[PDB]
């Protein structure tokens, strides 16, 4: 939904989306090669689906060529200083991929606006949306945009023949927040089921070595284990086929 979104958001209104109750398979998108850059910080490009986070934050917008390089931990640059400020300890992965064959259009695509100028840099992950006319000179402009006083937002106007520098590069940045129960975590494989062999099983929670055999015990719909009179594991419900 966030990557295959047809309708993105601009840069002065950079997005953020908490996502919960997921199995978050990062390897299906990481191994898609539809990305100009997959830059991970704090964590590894692989070695992710073995991580269980509290929530993830999917920001989604469109920037130009060099602005992607701008997007990095603790950077200084037009977007990074006045549209979307990453911290220095950003734990997550930036996803950049070109959209010149989708978003570019003849005559220009003037729908995307970036913040021209502002007095100060943003807090890490700060959301600055105020559309107050850029004040400067010596007087509060009061809307007239007097001398030294200009508009804060500037359109892009994506022309299809523009070079990569002006091309619409769609970017999505994910951060990994850890507080609380981890409700989003990468999938876990499940090998085939083998019976009648001393195997070293690890069912979803519990481990151990045994000889798995089709039983005739009737668990209750919600029970998972079975125990012996001395509190030893004796029956396990196959969490794939009950």
């Amino acid at each position: 939904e966030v990557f295959n979104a047809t309708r993105f958001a601009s840069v002065y209104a950079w997005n953020r989306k908490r996502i919960s109750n997921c199995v978050a398979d990062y390897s299906v998108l990481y191994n898609s090669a539809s990305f100009s850059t997959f830059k991970c910080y704090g964590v590894s490009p692989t070695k992710l689906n073995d991580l269980c986070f509290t929530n993830v934050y999917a920001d989604s917008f469109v920037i130009r060529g060099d602005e992607v390089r701008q997007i990095a931990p603790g950077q200084t640059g037009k977007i990074a200083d006045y549209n979307y400020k990453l911290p220095d300890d950003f734990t997550g992965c930036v996803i950049a991929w070109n959209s010149n064959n989708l978003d570019s259009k003849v005559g220009g695509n003037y729908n995307y606006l970036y913040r021209l100028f502002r007095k100060s840099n943003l807090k890490p992950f700060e959301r600055d949306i105020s559309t107050e006319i850029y004040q400067a000179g010596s007087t509060p402009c009061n809307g007239v945009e007097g001398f030294n006083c200009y508009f804060p937002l500037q359109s892009y106007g994506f022309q299809p023949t523009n070079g990569v520098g002006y091309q619409p590069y769609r970017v999505v940045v994910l951060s990994f927040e850890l507080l609380a129960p981890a409700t989003v975590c990468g999938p876990k494989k499940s090998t085939n089921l083998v019976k009648n062999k001393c195997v070293n099983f690890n069912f979803n929670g519990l481990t151990g070595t045994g000889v798995l055999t089709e039983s005739n015990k009737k668990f209750l719909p919600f029970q998972q284990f079975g125990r012996d009179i001395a509190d030893t594991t004796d029956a396990v419900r196959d969490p794939q086929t009950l």
């Epitope: 060099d66 006045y82 002006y166």
Partner: antibody, heavy 116, light 111 residues
Framework: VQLVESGGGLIQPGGSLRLSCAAS????????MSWVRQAPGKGLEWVSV???????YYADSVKGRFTISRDNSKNTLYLQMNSLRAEDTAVYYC????????????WGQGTLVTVS | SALTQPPSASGSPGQSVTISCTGT?????????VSWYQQHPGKAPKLMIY???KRPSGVPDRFSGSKSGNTASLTVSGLQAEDEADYYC???????????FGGGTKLTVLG
């Protein structure tokens, strides 16, 4: 916009010419400003800028050594230089503006700074 | 790289002249913003053609040349007794926020 840059002249490598670009007419604080210089018979050299967020940039032969400064108010605006070479021989100017956007329109009267 | 130009152009007072501005496709055929500058010897560098269809506010109208593909060009009609000056282009390189300038065009009128 009375940008009277002063303190320029002939200096051997090592000195730090605290150019004082008076911001008497236009602001240098909480705004965008730029320092540049032109060699005899040459275009302009983008040596420094300062943003509203106080951010700064230098070009290649001036990275690591050139450093911008200013009083907090509209008192003045500085540009500090280190390890000066003969190539740097360029009369200094101030460029009211910030980069390719916000073109440079207002300048100083011209301080003669020969770096050799 | 540099927006190189022939150092000299001659002409008659009253006619037009096109001051060229030439660099590779590395810059001029990648962006949409050029900036022309004209400067009397001694004057402050005064911009001429930024947003190539546009010029600064108070500049006269005989200016406003265009950009064709791999080169920009300022087309100034009616060479005045004031049109003698030096010319320098300006734009943004395709790397690390570098800004490139022009080599210099001297408008040389006959004696």
């Amino acid at each position: 916009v009375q940008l009277v840059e002063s303190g320029g002249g002939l200096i051997q490598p090592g000195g730090s010419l605290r150019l004082s670009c008076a911001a008497s007419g236009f602001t240098v604080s909480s705004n965008y400003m730029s320092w540049v210089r032109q060699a005899p018979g040459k275009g302009l050299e983008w040596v420094s800028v300062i943003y509203s967020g106080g951010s700064t940039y230098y070009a290649d032969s001036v990275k690591g050594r050139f450093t911008i400064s200013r009083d907090n108010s509209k008192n003045t605006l500085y540009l500090q230089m280190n390890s000066l070479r003969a190539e740097d021989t360029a009369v200094y100017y101030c460029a009211r503006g910030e980069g390719w956007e916000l073109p440079y329109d207002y300048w100083g009267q011209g301080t003669l700074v020969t770096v050799s | 790289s540099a927006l190189t130009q022939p150092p000299s152009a001659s002409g008659s007072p009253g006619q037009s002249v096109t001051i060229s501005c030439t660099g590779t496709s590395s810059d001029v055929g990648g962006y949409k913003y050029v900036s022309w500058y004209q400067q009397h010897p001694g004057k402050a560098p005064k911009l001429m053609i930024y947003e190539v269809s546009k010029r600064p506010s108070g500049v006269p109208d005989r200016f406003s040349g265009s950009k064709s593909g791999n080169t920009a060009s300022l087309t100034v009609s009616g060479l005045q007794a004031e049109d003698e000056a030096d010319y320098y282009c300006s734009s943004y390189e395709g790397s690390n926020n570098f800004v490139v300038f022009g080599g210099g065009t001297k408008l040389t009128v006959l004696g």
